[PDB]
Design a protein around this ligand. Structure first.
Ligand code: UT0
Length: 115
């Protein structure tokens, strides 16, 4: 169908807020990765399309998603970047796995409502 920007914001923003509410797990995802500040200068050699919660929020607020699946794609891009870059024993990797569980749980009923 056609999804209006405010329809997408009302339906999808609560799912993003559910991720933001996760502490400690969302903290590494609340702002774009800053490789120099974090001391990980190889980051952009591995992650070609960075994504984080604040960028997704901005895209929702500025109507940059036409379809719900584009929002889901960006959330999963954020997750896949973190699993790609970080080691499986690291905080960010395990935090990512927790956020993916939370997101799966929240997005399902919302997608049912948007159908
Ligand atoms: C370990 C090098 O750091 C990272 C590496 C990779 C990635 C990504 C998103 O692939 C993010 C971080 N950043 C990060 C990590 C842990 C914590 C804990 C609190 N915070 S914080 C200051 O409250 O934001 C953290 C911020």
């Amino acid at each position: 169908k056609i999804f209006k920007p405010e329809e997408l914001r009302q339906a999808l923003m609560p799912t993003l807020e559910a991720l933001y509410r996760q502490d400690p797990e969302s903290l590494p995802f609340r702002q774009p990765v800053d490789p120099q500040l974090l001391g990980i200068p190889d980051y952009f050699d591995i992650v070609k399309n960075p994504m984080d919660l604040s960028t997704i929020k901005r895209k929702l607020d500025t109507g940059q998603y036409q379809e719900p699946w584009q929002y889901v794609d960006d959330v999963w891009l954020m997750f896949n970047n973190a699993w790609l870059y970080n080691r499986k024993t690291s905080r960010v990797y395990k935090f990512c796995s927790k956020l993916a569980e939370v997101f799966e749980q929240e997005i399902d009923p919302v997608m049912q409502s948007l159908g």
